[PDB]
Amino acid sequence: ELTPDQQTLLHFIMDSYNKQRMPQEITNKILKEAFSAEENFLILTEMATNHVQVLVEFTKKLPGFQTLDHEDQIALLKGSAVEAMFLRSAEIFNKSGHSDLLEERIRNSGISDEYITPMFSFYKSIGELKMTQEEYALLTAIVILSPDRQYIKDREAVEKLQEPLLDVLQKLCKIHQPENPQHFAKLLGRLTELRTFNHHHAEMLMSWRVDHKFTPLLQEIWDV
Amino acid sequence: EHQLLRYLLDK
Ligand SMILES: Cc1cc(C(=O)O[C@@H]2C[C@H]3CC[C@]2(C)C3(C)C)ccc1N
Questions:
Q1: Distances (CA, A) of A45 to A58, A113, A132, A163
Q2: Minimum distance, in Å, between the CA of residue B7 and any CA atom of chain A
């Protein structure tokens, strides 16, 4: 069903999505470091940093992003970082435990259960759609290229980048889940759950600010 | 917003 131009678009997206590496140096710390609330928090700081790093790298290569107004580019990057990040951490969580040690660190890092619980529900809610890489990539791109973010000046230029991505996803849903015609709608339904992390994340940041220190990049991406 | 992000986008 994909047209030549849809294929071309899908390949660019996949090329860029696959260059995203969680560095070994960081995954190594998940086992190699001692556990305490402090060490765990440092590790998470570093992971969050890498997620945002990788988001920027992915974003800048999305077709048409470089043609956007430079202020709108920044608004999209800040607007989408939480959702993009939670989505990526789902993918990493579900594709060795390993996963187990990471889970343990998250659950001991000065984060209240009020936020941990939904985080892990979400990882489960994502994992039973059994999403392919293509689906993760396109969703991430759809999240990033949202015309509904605060401060955007030219919302139409964003919507024109986003819409084609949504078409490609709809067809992919029909090719990889031909027996479930509600799949596309389920993927989009998980986006509304993903959005609830904007509020949770701001609250986690607010309670961490009890003498705790953040990297430069996390300071800029979230204004803190 | 800011310099670090603009740098990371431009490089
Ligand atoms: C400012 C700041 C933010 C985070 C963060 O939200 O990211 C965490 C890492 C993963 C584990 C919990 C996170 C929210 C995650 C799912 C992205 C972690 C540390 C830190 N110093």
A1: 20, 18, 28, 34
A2: 10
How far is the centre of ligand 1, averaged over its atoms, from the C-alpha of A6 (Å)? 34
Cα A216 to ligand 1 centre (Å): 14
Q: How far apart, in whole angstroms, are the C-alpha atoms of residue A49 and residue A217?
A: 7
- Length of chain B (residues): 11
Experimental method: X-ray
Which residue from B minimizes the CA distance to A61?
Answer: B9
Q: Of A51, A44, A63, A3, which Cα lies nearest the Cα of A23? A: A51
> Ligand 1 centre from B7 Cα, in Å?
22
CB neighbours (10 Å) of residue A67?
9
Among candidate residues A94, A109, A88, the one with its CA nearest the CA of residue A22: A88
The C-alpha of A117 sits at a distance from chain B's nearest C-alpha, in angstroms, of 30
Measuring from atom 5 of ligand 1, which residue has the nearest CA? A48
Here the CATH number for the domain that contains residue A149 is 1.10.565.10
Quote the tokens at residue A126: 């994502």
The full 3-state SS of A174-207, as one line of letters, equals HHHCCCCCCHHHHHHHHHHHHHCHHHHHHHHHHH
Total domain count, chain A: 1
Which residue positions of A form the known binding site for chenodeoxycholate?
88, 115, 123, 201
Resolution of this structure in Å: 2.3
What is the extent of the structural domain holding A56? 1-224
